[PDB]
Amino acid sequence: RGWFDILDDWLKRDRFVFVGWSGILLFPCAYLALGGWLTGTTFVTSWYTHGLASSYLEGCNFLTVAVSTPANSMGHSLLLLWGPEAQGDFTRWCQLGGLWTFIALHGAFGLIGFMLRQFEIARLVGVRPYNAIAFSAPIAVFVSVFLIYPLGQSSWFFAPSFGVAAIFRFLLFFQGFHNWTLNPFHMMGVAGVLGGALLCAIHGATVENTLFQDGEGASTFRAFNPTQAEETYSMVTANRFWSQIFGIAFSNKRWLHFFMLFVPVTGLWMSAIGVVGLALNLRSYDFISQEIRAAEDPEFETFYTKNLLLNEGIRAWMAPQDQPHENFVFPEEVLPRGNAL
Amino acid sequence: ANLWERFCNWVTSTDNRLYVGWFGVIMIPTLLAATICFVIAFIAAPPVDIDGIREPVSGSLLYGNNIITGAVVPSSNAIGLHFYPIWEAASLDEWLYNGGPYQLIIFHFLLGASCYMGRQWELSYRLGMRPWICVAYSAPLASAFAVFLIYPIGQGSFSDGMPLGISGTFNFMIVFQAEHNILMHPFHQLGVAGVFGGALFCAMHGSLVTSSLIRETTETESANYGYKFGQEEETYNIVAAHGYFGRLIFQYASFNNSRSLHFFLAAWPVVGVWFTALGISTMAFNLNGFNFNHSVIDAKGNVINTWADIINRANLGMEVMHERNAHNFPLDLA
Amino acid sequence: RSWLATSHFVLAFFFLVGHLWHAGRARAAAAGFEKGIDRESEPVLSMPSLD
Amino acid sequence: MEPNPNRQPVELNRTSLYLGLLLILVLALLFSSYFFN
Amino acid sequence: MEVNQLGLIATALFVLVPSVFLIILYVQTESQQ
């Protein structure tokens, strides 16, 4: 046999952890992304890029550690270790935020590798590729949020920093500056995620409560055999129940499970489209008719205008520390504030 | 049979297109009342003085709102937790000004939704099923109770209940973050795990079953016609699905037992949502998310900011701007 | 007051979940179908169709 | 003119009609506010 | 309220064009042998 065929044999051996040709891309990249996150969160600072402490070594906890984005002055530089910024100096690279681009790039290629793994394994075992197809939603979210959005903004600095509290700050920044909650694409994403959770719960519970009695045990799990040919629960009884409770019910199992694929995947894709818009500040920020009315009529008020006031507060109070490169100095007298607070 | 016997047989009949049951006898009138009042109010109600400072907020379509901005506005802070039925007002004009529709709607809705859960149990009993679908439903219902009743009880006013509208919901969320730092609360983090994971596992399960469908149709026909309602045999190959997923991660990370699988699907999101409901219901009593403001200090004593401090700046913006005319004293104690 | 109120709301709610769980199961076990549906006497199969 | 053998009948069942109408009407309800602006 | 004038026709067509597409397909399915 040729060396290519021998290598294919070895890569596709049946072992505890499947490797595959996709493994050559997936495993080094996924390992480097995860290891970079752990290394940065344990030992690396954000002092020179954000003015922040961001590691266990500095005293942060699991909620506050992060691998923070590079400084805004770096633009969209790849920040390669051998690049002109760090110039091969590992310590300076870490201090300049090279770990953020390191993680983002090795992670993107790791996602590519994992999807290729889905395809490869499906082909080898003879199943259809719908798991790989569904994984396109996480990939679309990751690309839109961590690459396209910063690429449309001034620099990597405004991408999410890899951390719990940093992600929370990302949420609040999007509310304050983009009015992201008002965006119908985020709304469709929310519908997809919450509806997916609803479907997950309702289907699990319906199956578990329409099981057939296939054993004498009061714990019903042992009464299923993976090689059995018969359905383990009564579709007829479940359909009757939901028809009489909610008015409509599934009657086709194949449609049911495809719908479970369709809902969350579509929702995430819609959210990604919205974020592509926000990359250009192309927001659903205002309703022009309401703004005209409110400008002319000081007694007109809605929850929309109230939320706009909240956004103005967020921007004014968070910008000076969240965007240190701007050198904002907002005198106390200019800060928006309500009475007494 | 006597008249009462006949009526009981009809009420509990499993042959009605929609089951009624004894829980339904309460559910139907209350949900109808809540629905009718909500629709009428959303379309036509006049502005409501939510914060009790004689600054009415417009919620209805006819008074300048669209679908996204409209809402049934919570009852006035002047009312607090007082019961404000129509007959407690001097007139419908006063009732509307003070936001009575909100109380009518949410009370009838909460009662009707509780009865909806009970009705799920009751019909399962009539049909000879196992009983715990209602337990699954208790998670979203608990969330509704948390935002419509528990949080108002803890804070002392139905004016702090969630508004019945889209932008109103956003307002509720933002103020909640300003006053309780919900993002840094472990129960909301468990809720996010619950819903992200629920969506994830929904997609995973749907995709695995769809990938293991057994060939029963041609390429010109939808594969869904390969399943006939009520057929005895399973329509997909769970053994193949397990082979795939076990090789995707590793053998022992994949379910080979469909019953265990579906129990996990039920349990993950349901428990997550229970915990998030408890998060709202406990922040109702002002036990707030983690506060690490100025936790990191240097040798001299300089504050070294963290992402938590950045969050705090955003929260301060929200806090100082919300309900801009309602506070007279320095602390917002409820 | 905050500690006590939060703790006991959590406990009260989970005990409501317990009531529902054990009451439903008690009804099902007394009636004889807490282990599942009998295949040869599935109640719904003997009922008229809704439509 | 010999007929084309590649023709196939097309179908949309009633449940699909209901699902599609629901999708369309809900999308309209969602986006109408932004169309009116 | 000073709304976008074209919003009315935008919404009407957004609803009607896909809905009529679906109705055509459904009725011609029902009429098949």
Binding site: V236, S243, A249 | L61 | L50 | Y18, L22, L25, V26 | -
Partner: peptide, 30 residues
């Protein structure tokens, strides 16, 4: 016009509910 549009769409959705529940294609066992 905008209020009419919103309410019209809502009423159409409710009618759709009615037909989808009471005029569904009936499930039929094989």
């Amino acid at each position: 016009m905008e209020t009419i549009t919103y309410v019209f769409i809502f009423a159409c959705i409710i009618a759709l509910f009615f037909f989808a529940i009471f005029f569904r294609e009936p499930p039929r066992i094989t």
